[PDB]
Amino acid sequence: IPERVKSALWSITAGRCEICCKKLYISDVTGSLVNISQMAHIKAFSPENNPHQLDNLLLLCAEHHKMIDTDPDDFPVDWLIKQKKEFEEKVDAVIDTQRIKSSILSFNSIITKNDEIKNEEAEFPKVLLFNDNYFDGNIYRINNALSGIEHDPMYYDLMCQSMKQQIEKIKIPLNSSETISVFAIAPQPLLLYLGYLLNDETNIKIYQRFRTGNLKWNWESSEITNNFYVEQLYTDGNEIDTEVNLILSLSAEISLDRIPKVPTLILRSDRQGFDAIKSNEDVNEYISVFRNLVVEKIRNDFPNLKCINIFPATPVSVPVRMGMNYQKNIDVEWKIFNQQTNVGFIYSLSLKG
Amino acid sequence: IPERVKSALWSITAGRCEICCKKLYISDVTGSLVNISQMAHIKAFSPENNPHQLDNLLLLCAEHHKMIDTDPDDFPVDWLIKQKKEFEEKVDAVIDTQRIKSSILSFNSIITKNDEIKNEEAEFPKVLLFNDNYFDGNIYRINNALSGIEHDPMYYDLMCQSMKQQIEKIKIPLNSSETISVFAIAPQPLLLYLGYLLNDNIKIYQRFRTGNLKWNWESSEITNNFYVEQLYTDGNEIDTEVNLILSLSAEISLDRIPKVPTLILRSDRQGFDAIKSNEDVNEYISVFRNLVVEKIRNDFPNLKCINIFPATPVSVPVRMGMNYQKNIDVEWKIFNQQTNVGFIYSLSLKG
Ligand SMILES: [Zn+2]
Ligand SMILES: [Zn+2]
């Protein structure tokens, strides 16, 4: 008779007789009560910790409370425990259909003020709630420790190495995570490389940052809002060419006089601009058109393919999802370029085996 | 505010934050607590009679309590009610996979002492518990009000009608029952007629001699084979009547049968336990409807009558009367072995 364990047991049972499931917080003819403290009868099997102290007692209504202790013949503790477990496990099986634990991986090379990075990472658990997850306390940050080398030709190489090292330094907590929600925003080559480092570690949700709304990182639609298509800039394929230019024109339409002649394909979205991507479904459809209607088309049209030159103008989630889709030692080398200021499209980094 | 309603709310939620489902009766690092009185935070929208007093507040952990009121922008009360109803209704949907309500219909023309009839009907809700049901308070008894004319040539004629009236007198609560568990024991013609009166979630139970629960099943799986033996070379169209002999409890010898083509429906194991499970009864009814009645309807397109001579446990005639298809089947004349004289006509099933 300790009121704490009573409260816990009333909770595990949803306030019900563990045989007939009568609500013991409701009178048999009217409204409420002083409830399980009075109406309910706990049966103790045989004489603040809890290890199976909860797995000893069981709630009962009046009828079955008598019934089951005045016939220990038909109702052994053997059958009784079976009934207890088979009901409680059907109750707490609601986790299995509720929200799921999810860790958070954050990477922000664009926002520099530290008290603003914190200000903004304060919205991630809310987005997790809005996308059928909940924050399990583990947040992983990729260090922008090299903001000092931000314009040295070697920046990408070193930032890549840093990223790789950190990712591997948390690889075991990454593969063992229930779900990983990623909030990444950085130059498109580094986003691609982040997607490469991850590479479908079971359950990963890649989120997109918008300008508008209370939650910049939350989706703005839950359904497909764009068509993505391909336009090839070469009459038909051959077997001498080893390199192909692939131009992703989602955020803007990249004009060809910016591209350093080599066969080219252009992957467009119908609606171009800041909102080419509005839902996870948009990203899925983009990646489908990308792998099937673009990359595989390139591998077919060019069996002697040795390199793809990627020129992107895409929102943040798209390079990460492209870097996740890479098939190591089955795909070719992917050289990703980045528009440096004034200079045009300049090489940034590469994906290999 | 009052722990009066708090206990009910802790119950509807299974002791959990209605967003993240953290168990609020367990510490984040160790064992138990003083639990939801301390660890939990109820959010009230605005200020022991519960009609939606329960549908106002909601449980929260620390994190999400601090989170959801310091952000009424993303978290309006509309979204909160949506989450609350979804989770709460997702919780109490476990009855839908628990026990099922079941009413009780009792009929005992064999046991006569009144303090023994009640003594024995005190065991029915226990059988309901052991067969995935629970008693919903409604017990229906078919009255053996004619115990005094039990041997008058017309007894059956009257008893049937009595039963019929009683059935109609509760016909409306019978169609509306979640489940109806039947504990019937009487001469096989009356059991057949009871099954006919029912004709429909109905669980027909069998009484055994041995065990703590005479009426509970003794197996949950098939324990017998039922087969047919025909005593006529092939069918014709001149015959209008057929003798059907059900030899489950014993092997009815034919010199007791009042010549007419005959089929015999036997079980491998005959005796008091030819039927041991509901599955045995299902298999019997399958062999009966398909391998017997339809066989006769084929072999005899000018069929006009089936003569039933039974030796079956109590559940079998009731289930046969349940399986009767009115105005598709023919007349079923059911006989009962009366003392010395052999099988004497008892009653009939028609349209
Ligand atoms: Zn109960
Ligand atoms: Zn919570």
Side-chain angles (χ1 to χ4, degrees), chain A residues 16 71 83 90 95 126, chain B residues 71 95 97-99 126:
Chain A
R16 290 192 174 178
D71 188 336
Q83 303 308 293
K90 292 188 285 184
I95 319 173
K126 312 182 168 184
Chain B
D71 208 305
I95 42 173
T97 192
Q98 293 300 114
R99 302 292 184 185
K126 311 183 172 184

Side-chain angles (χ1 to χ4, degrees), chain B residues 77-227:
Chain B
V77 301
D78 315 327
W79 182 86
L80 298 172
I81 295 298
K82 198 180 97 81
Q83 308 320 117
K84 176 173 180 177
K85 292 179 172 181
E86 288 213 9
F87 175 66
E88 285 180 337
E89 297 165 359
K90 218 155 190 186
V91 173
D92 78 347
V94 289
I95 42 173
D96 304 340
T97 192
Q98 293 300 114
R99 302 292 184 185
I100 298 169
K101 287 211 155 198
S102 167
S103 61
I104 283 183
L105 182 135
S106 175
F107 177 53
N108 206 328
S109 82
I110 285 178
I111 284 186
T112 179
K113 281 199 167 73
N114 181 279
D115 54 308
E116 295 288 334
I117 281 177
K118 290 181 174 293
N119 188 0
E120 185 180 2
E121 68 180 2
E123 85 173 15
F124 297 153
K126 311 183 172 184
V127 186
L128 277 299
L129 293 193
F130 279 72
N131 273 109
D132 287 332
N133 285 110
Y134 71 106
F135 184 53
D136 60 351
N138 319 300
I139 182 150
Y140 307 124
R141 307 181 181 83
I142 299 297
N143 291 328
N144 208 20
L146 284 71
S147 79
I149 69 191
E150 200 164 5
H151 282 126
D152 176 284
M154 284 202 48
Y155 166 86
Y156 285 124
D157 268 329
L158 295 187
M159 187 48 96
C160 279
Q161 300 185 41
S162 186
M163 284 171 71
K164 175 158 158 286
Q165 299 174 352
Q166 308 200 49
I167 288 299
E168 289 170 345
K169 205 202 286 191
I170 57 155
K171 169 58 66 186
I172 310 280
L174 283 161
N175 310 135
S176 82
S177 283
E178 300 272 338
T179 311
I180 292 171
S181 297
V182 187
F183 302 97
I185 176 171
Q188 300 170 116
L190 295 179
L191 290 185
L192 184 65
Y193 187 70
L194 177 62
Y196 169 85
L197 289 176
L198 294 184
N199 193 257
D200 176 4
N201 271 321
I202 282 172
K203 301 175 158 196
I204 304 290
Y205 284 87
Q206 169 70 23
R207 192 198 195 288
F208 307 82
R209 255 87 174 159
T210 74
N212 292 317
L213 310 167
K214 275 70 175 173
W215 280 102
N216 190 6
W217 296 107
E218 284 183 336
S219 169
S220 305
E221 60 189 1
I222 290 173
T223 67
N224 223 318
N225 165 255
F226 309 89
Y227 55 86

